Amino acid sequence: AKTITIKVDTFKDRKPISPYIYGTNQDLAGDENMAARRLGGNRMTGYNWENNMSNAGSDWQQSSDNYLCSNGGLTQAECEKPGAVTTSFHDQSLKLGTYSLVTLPMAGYVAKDGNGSVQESEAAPSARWNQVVNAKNAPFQLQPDLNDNYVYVDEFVHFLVNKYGTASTKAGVKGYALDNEPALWSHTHPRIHGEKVGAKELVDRSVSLSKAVKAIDAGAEVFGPVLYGFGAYKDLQTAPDWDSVKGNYSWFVDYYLDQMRLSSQVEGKRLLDVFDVHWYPEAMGGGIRITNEVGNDETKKARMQAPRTLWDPTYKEDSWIAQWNSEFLPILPRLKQSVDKYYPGTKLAMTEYSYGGENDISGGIAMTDVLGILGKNDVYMANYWKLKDGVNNYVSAAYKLYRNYDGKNSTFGDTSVSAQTSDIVNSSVHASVTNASDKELHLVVMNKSMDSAFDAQFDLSGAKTYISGKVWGFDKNSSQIKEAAPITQISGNRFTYTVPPLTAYHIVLTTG
Ligand SMILES: OC[C@H]1CN[C@H](O)[C@@H](O)[C@@H]1O[C@@H]1O[C@H](CO)[C@@H](O)[C@H](O)[C@H]1O
Ligand SMILES: [Ca+2]
Ligand SMILES: [Cl-]
């Protein structure tokens, strides 16, 4: 039998875990007890708040239609009401108690109608499109003009604030994203913005839209640039002006941060609150990218190791990013370095990601690691994106393990503390307390081996003596979170518990 040693010190490296790292785009089973929800993604670029119409772009026939009403569960009558996709979304956030991050259009046009495919020569401007104007500079209407050629973004923000109050209030919409994946506009939304976006163009569009938003709600958090992936972090997907603007910047991430900082300085107001990226691992195993399909045993093993690309300086995954751009990995410390230097005080969000294997134990184990990693690496907000339609049972299990492990919405603690393991390959472990508790200690531990159990010997440093523990977990046999055998013998703040292959447990220790 293999033994791993795990050292947990509740005094050491305490740091707040932002609850918004427990976040999603599509709602999952509904009992994950999320803290953040996003209304974002390709459909939002051309979403027209006045009539709820949007355009699929390259995802489906360049089709303008009422998909977002359908996706939101709206009736045909509700679909006709201005703002209804967004207000239905936010009403649900209020009911669930989550943050709402809402996307605003910046690519320049939105769908005028719901009448289907838009052909290449029907590209904007045309009868199929209304133009976006950031600041109306006229009296706002709660019932916007449906017959003109415009949608006014500040009018939409005024409409939300009129209904819910400002971002600083309990009921307010708190976050607005500057569109979605701008470096892919020319690929995903060729009917709206067929030219490759420029680096300077993206800053200028962003400054104009953010100013208009902040003029209505100074407390709203503006998220950008909502980058699709590493090619865009590097040079905005080969933006045509990159060589002319790049100067001494290592990557587009720095150019954007410094430019938003500079624009904010000149405007006299912060125009970027959260630096916003999407991260879909390029990590490969068994010849398959982990986000493409569950794959074979080597794909599964690579899926469970891939979260180390987020934090571990020693880990080199199999991908073109690690092959040609290793100096930018691990990615979270690299992003944080950039933000802290080029626009101090800006937060970091990963507003789409997935490690694949949605209905496989490997996808569950990967996510159990990622949620602990995000919480203790200064990520403000993170939102899973469903790459597979229908149930994603093992992704849901990972969230429930952290956020509803008992069926009563009991959670991991709000304060990360130091948890170290002797074997970073076969195990990962994350620890937390709440309000500096010396009474309850939370540990999430997992075995990534496909083959071999280990005995985890835990050594705990705390102000009081832990005397017993309850355990909940999931494994290859059941994605439901089941109660496991309790820990009844803890002597001198040490205990041992066997973790079978491909198993994740949440252990809750108590002093009383
Ligand atoms: O390809 C998966 C992700 C990549 N990021 C995009 O922002 C996101 O929109 C895209 O998912 C597509 O999303 C649209 C809805 O916006 C959906 O209809 C399509 O099936 C997804 O692939
Ligand atoms: Ca209008
Ligand atoms: Cl992008």
Residue identified by tokens 């990360």 is: 416
Q: What angle do CA 137, 140, 143 make, to 5 degrees?
A: 140
Breaks (C-N over 2.5 A) in the chain follow: none
Q: For residue 70, give the ligand nearest its CA.
A: 1
Question: What is the stated resolution of the deposited model, in angstroms?
Answer: 1.9
Residue 131, classed as helix, strand or coil, is strand
Distance CA 95, CA 431 (A): 29
Homologous superfamily of the 1-17+407-512 domain (CATH): Golgi alpha-mannosidase II (2.60.40.1180)
Token pair of 216 as six digits: 């209505």
Catalytic residue, from 32, 120, 155, 181: name it.
Answer: 181
Backbone φ and ψ for 231, nearest 5 degrees, come out as: -60, -35
Token pair of 387 as six digits: 């790459």
Query: Which atom of ligand 1 lies nearest, measured to the CA of 387?
Result: 2
Token pair of 115 as six digits: 């009448």
CB 416 within 8 A of CB 19: no
AA identity, residue 413 = G
Ligand 1 site, residue 103, Cβ cutoff 6 A: no
Cα–chain-centroid distance for residue 285?
24
Distance CA 445, CA 313 (A): 21
C-alpha closest to that of 275 among 330, 216, 345, 326: 345
CA-CA-CA-CA torsion sign (221, 222, 227, 233):
negative
User: Which of 26, 42, 392 has most ligand 1 atoms within 8 Å of its beta carbon, as the pocket-test mutant?
Assistant: 42
Q: Which CATH architecture describes the domain 18-406?
A: Alpha-Beta Barrel (3.20)
AA identity, residue 257 = L
For the chain, give every domain's residue range: 1-17+407-512, 18-406
Q: Annotate 88-124 with DSSP letters as a single string.
A: HHHHHHHHHT-EEEEEE--SSEEE----EE--GGGPS
Q: How many CB atoms lie within 10 A of CB 310?
A: 23
Ligand 1 site, residue 41, Cβ cutoff 6 A: yes
Q: Which residues surround ligand 3, an ion (CB under 5 A)?
A: 181, 183, 227-228, 232
Distance CA 137, CA 140 (A): 8
Backbone φ and ψ for 243, nearest 5 degrees, come out as: -60, -35
Residue identified by tokens 């790049």 is: 246
C-alpha closest to that of 370 among 451, 316, 305, 322: 305
Strands (E) in 236-394, as ranges, are 274-279, 284-285, 288-289, 347-353, 381-384
CB 90 within 8 A of CB 102: yes
Give the H or E element holding residue 78.
helix 76-79
Ligand 1 site, residue 180, Cβ cutoff 6 A: yes
Q: How many CB atoms lie within 10 A of CB 480?
A: 11
Q: What is the largest CA-CA distance in the chain?
A: 75
Give residues with Cβ within 8 angstroms of 251, minimum separation 6.
233, 234, 235, 328, 338
Q: Which residues pair with 277 in a beta bridge?
A: 227, 350
Measured between its terminal Cα atoms, the distance across the chain in Å is 32
Residues in the chain: 512
Q: Is 181 a catalytic residue?
A: yes
Token pair of 84 as six digits: 């209804």
